[PDB]
Amino acid sequence: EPPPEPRITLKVGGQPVTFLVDTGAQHSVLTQNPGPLSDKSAWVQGATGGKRYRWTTDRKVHLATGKVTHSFLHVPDCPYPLLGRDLLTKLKAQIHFEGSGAQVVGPMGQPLQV
Amino acid sequence: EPPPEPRITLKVGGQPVTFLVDTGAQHSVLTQNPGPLSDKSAWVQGATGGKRYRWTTDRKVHLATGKVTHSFLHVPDCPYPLLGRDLLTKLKAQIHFEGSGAQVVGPMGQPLQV
Ligand SMILES: CC(C)CN(C[C@@H](O)[C@H](Cc1ccccc1)NC(=O)O[C@H]1CCOC1)S(=O)(=O)c1ccc(N)cc1
Numbered sequence: 001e002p003p004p005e006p007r008i009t010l011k012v013g014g015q016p017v018t019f020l021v022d023t024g025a026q027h028s029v030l031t032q033n034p035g036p037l038s039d040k041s042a043w044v045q046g047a048t049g050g051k052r053y054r055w056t057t058d059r060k061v062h063l064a065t066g067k068v069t070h071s072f073l074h075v076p077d078c079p080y081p082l083l084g085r086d087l088l089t090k091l092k093a094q095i096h097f098e099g100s101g102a103q104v105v106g107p108m109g110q111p112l113q114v
Numbered sequence: 115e116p117p118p119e120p121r122i123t124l125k126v127g128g129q130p131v132t133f134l135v136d137t138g139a140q141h142s143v144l145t146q147n148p149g150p151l152s153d154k155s156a157w158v159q160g161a162t163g164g165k166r167y168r169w170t171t172d173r174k175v176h177l178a179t180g181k182v183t184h185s186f187l188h189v190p191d192c193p194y195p196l197l198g199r200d201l202l203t204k205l206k207a208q209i210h211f212e213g214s215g216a217q218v219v220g221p222m223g224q225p226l227q228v
Contacts, residue, residue: 004140004199021138049191088211097207
């Protein structure tokens with residue numbers, strides 16, 4: 001069920017979501033229970049092929065850097081939710097590989113977990 | 115055309131490869147003219163579906179610490195090579211978004227002395 005490290009939990013529309021922190025993902029992804037969906041869609045290129053997916057409606061996302069509004073792709077084919085570059089750029093996150101795992105820290109150097 | 119940031123160029127098999135640095139990738143990936151392939155394969159579970167891809171035979175990769183022997187998945191459905199968690203752990207790498215764009219550095223903050 002839970003993603004491998006680097007992972008981070010964020011309050012997304014008043015619910016916790018544990019994301020795989022995914023620097024290779026252009027946009028962020030919800031997989032199950034995405035909440036209300038919008039009418040609009042996008043083509044998603046994955047490693048093994050491409051498919052059309054729907055955008056969620058807007059969600060409040062409680063980033064350590066301050067709350068923002070964000071829409072996610074609803075990708076039920078995807079193994080777990082993905083925190084991609086669209087939100088990492090807002091969070092201004094640092095990702096540190098150390099030991100056999102990885103930890104996320106904020107733009108002030110504050111740990112975002114552990 | 116380079117991959118988006120965060121990206122890094124490493125010598126593989128003696129020649130430079132520019133990777134998208136990808137914390138969402140369990141294993142590192144090459145995509146074009148990969149050289150000799152093993153008889154072995156892995157199931158790759160992508161955002162949009164899954165299927166199997168071949169492992170390469172061993173490659174010399176020049177990291178910061180010097181040479182490592184590493185096997186890559188050959189995934190021609192991927193638009194660019196991916197440097198995954200396997201090698202990010204070996205490199206003890208840090209990824210920073212707080213700068214403009216995204217940058218990748220070593221265990222002590224040096225853009226990789228690779
Ligand atoms: C889906 C995650 C869980 C795993 N993938 C890594 C991801 O970062 C993946 C990398 C990628 C970039 C550009 C085009 C195609 C693929 N980006 C991705 O699909 O972007 C989508 C999701 C939303 O935004 C768009 S993987 O490529 O399937 C993968 C799986 C196993 C190995 N060993 C290596 C790679």
